[PDB]
Structures are given as structure tokens and as C-alpha cells.
Design a binder for this molecule. Sequence first.
Ligand SMILES: NC(=O)c1ccc[n+]([C@@H]2O[C@H](COP(=O)([O-])OP(=O)(O)OC[C@H]3O[C@@H](n4cnc5c(N)ncnc54)[C@H](OP(=O)(O)O)[C@@H]3O)[C@@H](O)[C@H]2O)c1
Ligand SMILES: [NH3+]C1CCCCC1
Lengths: 340, 340
Amino acid sequence: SKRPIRIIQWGCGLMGQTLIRTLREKGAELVGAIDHNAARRDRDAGEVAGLGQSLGVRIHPPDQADAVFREARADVCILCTRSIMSELAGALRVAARHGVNAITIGEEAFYPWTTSQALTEELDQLARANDCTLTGSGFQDVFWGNLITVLAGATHRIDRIVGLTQYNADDYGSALAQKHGVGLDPETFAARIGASNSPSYVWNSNEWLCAQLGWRVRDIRQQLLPTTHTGTLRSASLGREVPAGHATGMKAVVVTETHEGPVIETHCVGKLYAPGEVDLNEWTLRGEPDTTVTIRQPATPALTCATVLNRLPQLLAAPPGFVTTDRFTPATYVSRLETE
Amino acid sequence: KRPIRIIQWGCGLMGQTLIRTLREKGAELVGAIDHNAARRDRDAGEVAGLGQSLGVRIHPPDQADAVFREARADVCILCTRSIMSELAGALRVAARHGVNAITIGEEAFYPWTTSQALTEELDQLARANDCTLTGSGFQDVFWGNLITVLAGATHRIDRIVGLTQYNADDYGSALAQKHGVGLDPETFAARIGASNSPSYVWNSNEWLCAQLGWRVRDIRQQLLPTTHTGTLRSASLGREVPAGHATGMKAVVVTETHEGPVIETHCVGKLYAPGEVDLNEWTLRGEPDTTVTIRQPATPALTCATVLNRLPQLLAAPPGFVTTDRFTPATYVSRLETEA
Ligand SMILES: NC(=O)c1ccc[n+]([C@@H]2O[C@H](COP(=O)([O-])OP(=O)(O)OC[C@H]3O[C@@H](n4cnc5c(N)ncnc54)[C@H](OP(=O)(O)O)[C@@H]3O)[C@@H](O)[C@H]2O)c1
Ligand SMILES: [NH3+]C1CCCCC1
């Protein structure tokens, strides 16, 4: 006897709407919905997600999260809100206090152990105390992660791993556009983005690779450079026109040096696209032998959401704590989001 | 910790690569078997092209029991033949001496339906003697965990479509022979086409179904000769193949599941005209559609490196004939060492 996995969606923006539609297609049940956005509070989650039949799941503001957790009897909270642990920790604490497993697409949560050590250790203790698992997943899990380590499993010697990834700032909400400096003039970009040099998404995903490959990080160097176009580009995400020479987004170059010798160099571009530009994911393992993998035009948003859903049975089965996916076996295709 | 102790059975092109590379990863060659007249009584290091002899004389197979009793080996690597009926002799010797065996023999990757009785016999023998037998090679990642790791980021799979191509000349006589290299069209039809023996991707498609949790309903295979407009040399057979003779074999395997998804795999093993390269391109068709390309895979080096990376898992695995779908994916290993 199987029952649907019971999901609270926290963040009912572009990604959250995709997850609401897709979790139901896999046989899961939406049992709670939280969003602070004015336009969405009090609407039916089904309606907002573009379903034709309302779900009977009212979107609550976050100040009512404890009420929606107590009512919902959920197996899992999916959190699609912000990129950094400081801005995710509040929602993760709520899920943990209620003993509800949580998975976030928030990029830092993929591997936050050094970048937000104290928040991660506190959440790990709380999740342990309440007998639930927290984790970070998304596009990184396969495409900047297990894709590379499965190919490393066919490699005799690795000298260097080199990654090139690119995604469209317009496909995601304002947390991503903001992190990438979309619409900033060159001087403001340098001063706000370049100067503060906050860990890019591939800072955390390169640490995940080292953890799964069994390497120890010695140093990480990052440069954030504005991306630019010769014409004006419109940001539907931030609702701003970006004139030629203003930042259309950010290229991050991260070089991860290990004690063991190998280095991971990852170029990560989030920007507005000129006509004919597409998502990229290309990796080379340099050593013996040299191997290059190319994903032809990854459907980055769809792939993000599908790995989150495929992870859910492993998240339920996982031991309690904040357990990053480097400690899991790779995500497997799940036909139905149901549990015994 | 001590080096893993390896008997190399088959000291041809792949066996020479393994002898050189296993030592580079900190394993120790303790035995060598080869039936080739040119290699019998020579030092395995010398034959592998090392400048310093290893003190390991290549024995003919009629002396295999003697080399196993003497060597006290942890692992036998078997690089000889493609099909279980031709591998069984060596696997029986390894198992009777309680030594773990891993073969690049392609049927051994997943032989449970194609050679059921041989596999069940070897499984009980291996169990009686407290050792693990398995099949690995290029298939393990590039026709296997590469696909299932991408499947982990997929919402719905309708069809998996594979195109792979390798150079018949990179592997020695047994593979050239299996691919009908140098056969005239009539002999090809009669020996190869007519008998329709399981191509390598018959067994690898069954492995994919086992790891994705699908049940095979039917498998259909067409074997067609490959041809060139010019004469080509097989360095493995040392013969010229004139225009219109078989330069190798294209296999098309359609694997239908009870669940609905189908795996359609196109597999070409042939002599290469100038400019031709190895290929490995897969599409997961469904939601979303994902295409992965390996740019000119170094198929031989990848075959050997995944066998070595598998060794710690082969030692750890329970006794019996345990196909690699029951293992977690191969992981990059720096040092081939074991306890006590
Ligand atoms: N790991 C990955 O592979 C991956 C993939 C895609 C996106 N992401 C990231 O995950 C996050 C969500 O992406 P998205 O594109 O769906 O952004 P989005 O369209 O802005 O949607 C997020 C929703 O959450 C709301 N929100 C933000 N903070 C909240 C809080 N504390 N409580 C309740 N609701 C809150 C937002 O409201 P407002 O609009 O009012 O702020 C919005 O409705 C972003 O930071 C993005 O970078 C990660
Ligand atoms: N951070 C998300 C947006 C695209 C890159 C990886 C997933």
C-alpha cells in the first residue's frame, strides 16, 4: 500500500509553479503553499501554478508558516526562495522545528559547510533533534556534480576539472538577477558585486565535487566580471531595460585548489541573452585520459525541478541532520512520488 | 594498508594498459596469464612496455591453477574474449581459488538472460569461495551510469536513444572477429547477421533497465556490416580489408520495457577511414529532452580506468556474480590499497 508524498511548496514563483505542476504529475500531493509575494498571497496554489482545477491549497504568507506546517502533516517542504543560507535558514528552521524533511534549490545550501558554517551546523543539530533531513539540490546536483564524478569514475588520473556553465537570468526570479548585478552600471557593478566577491554558485558546487571526490580544499579564488551586450536588453525578471555597456549579468571564474594536487576551474555565467544565446554546460576532465562532456542546450529550469523531485524518496530515507547530497548515492529517476 | 594484489589474465593491448596503470595507482601485479606464443615466458612488465622487469613471468592458461595457488591474489582482471562461454574457464579458475574477478568481456557486463545458466553457476561457485565476479569496461559509465545520472534530473522518460562508435583496431583480434572485420558480405550474413548473437549494447541496455528499475518485455537487434569505399587495414588481424568487405558491424538494439519506456541504441565497431572518431551521444526523450555528447571519447583508456576504479567496490561487494548495477557508481580512486 502506497500513499502520495505530502509536499509544502515554500516559494510559489517561477520554479515553485513548475514544482507544483510537476509534483502532481508524479503523484505527489501539495498540502501547503507559502509565498510572501503580494500578487500570490490568498490565491489557490494550483491557480497560481496555471492548473485548470484549484487544489484547495491557499498560499499563506511566511508569518503563518507554523500554522501551515501543523495543519499539513507534510513529508517534505520544497524551498525555492533565495540563494544564500542566511536568507534560507529561517524557512529551514521552521521545517526542522516541525520534524519535516526539507530540500531547497537555494544555491549556497548545495554545500554550505564552509561558506555558512555556523548556520549549517545549527540547522544540522536542529534537524537531528527533530528526526528530519535538510538538503540543497537543483541543477548543480547532476550538472555541476554527479555528471562530473561519474566521469571521474572512468578516469585514470585527474590533473584539472574545467567547467563552463551559462543560464538565463530571465528564467529565474529577482534573487538571481540581484546576485548577478543585472542592470548595474559598470562602476556600481565593480563596487557592489566585484568588490564584495560573495561566493558564486560554483564556489559551493566545486566544494561539493572535492567532498565527493575525497579531496581537501587548500584555496578558492573567484573573480566576478560584468557581462555586457552591444545592444539594449530587457529584463522581464527585474522589469528593467539594460542599455549597451551596462551589466547584463555576471561571469564568475572560481579556481578551487586541493591539498591532493588537482584543481577545479569553473566559469559560471548568469546574464540576459542576446538573440541566439543558449544555456551551456560543458566540462573537461584533464589528465589521463582527457574527457569532455557537453549537454546540448540544457533545459536548466526543468532539470533543476526534476532532480529535486527525484531526490524526495532519498531525502525521506536519509538519516536526520543537514545532509548534503555528496553523502547520497546519485539521484535516480522516480516514476511515482509515493511512499509506503 | 597494503597494495591490492592483481593477476592480469590477457596481456594484449588492454592487459598491457592495465599492467602499466594498476601500478601507477599503487596496486601490485602478482601473476600474468596469456596464451599468445609471443608473450609466454616474457616478463609482464616488459610486454606492457615498462623499462624495468617486474619479476612476473607470463604463464600459459594450462598453468593458471599453479599461478593462482602461488600468487595469493585479491583480484584477477580478465581481458580475453567478449562472450560468457569463452570467459567461463578463466572465471571458474579465479572463483575456485577464492579470488575476486572483474572482466572487460562485454557479455559479462550483464549476462543474466543472455547466458543465464553460466552466470548462475559462476554466482554459486563465487559464493562457495567467498569472492565476487563482475563485468565492467566502457559500458559501466558511458552506456550506463552516464545515462542513469542524467535520468535522475528527468521528469518523464519516453525513450533513451544512444549512438556509440569505437575503433575495432584499438582492441585486438577477439573484438575484430566478433564484428566480422574482413568478412565478405555472404560470410558476414551467415556468421554474424544470421546468428544475431547479443551485441554489446544488448547486455548494456539490460543493465540500464536493471539500474533504472524497469522490467524488459522484448529486445530486438539488427546486425549490419559496416563498409568503406576504400581499402582499410586491421592492425589487430594484420590484414587489408578491400572496399565492399565488412570493416565491422553496426548493431541497432531496441529494448522495450513493461513500464513503457524504450532504449534504442546504435552501436558501431569498425575500422576507421581517415578523419573518423569514437562517438558517444545519448538523448533522454521526454520531459525535458536532454542530449549528452562525449567529444571523441578515449574509449580504451576509459575502459581500463573504470575497471581499476571498480576494484575497491569489487573487494567490498558480497560474494557471488554481482553485476555493477548493484554497486554505487564507480568513484575516482587515487590508491588501490586494502586492509590487514
Ligand atoms: N539550485 C538551482 O539549480 C536553482 C535553479 C533555479 C533557481 N534557483 C534559485 O532558487 C530561488 C528561487 O528561484 P525563482 O527563480 O523561482 O525566484 P522567484 O520567481 O523570485 O520566486 C521565489 C518566490 O519566493 C518568494 N519569497 C522569497 N523569499 C521568501 C520568504 N522568506 N518567504 C516566502 N516567500 C519568499 C518570492 O517573493 P518575492 O518575489 O515577493 O520576493 C517569490 O514568489 C532563487 O534564489 C534562484 O536563484 C536555484
Ligand atoms: N542556480 C540555479 C539557476 C541556474 C544555475 C543553477 C541552478
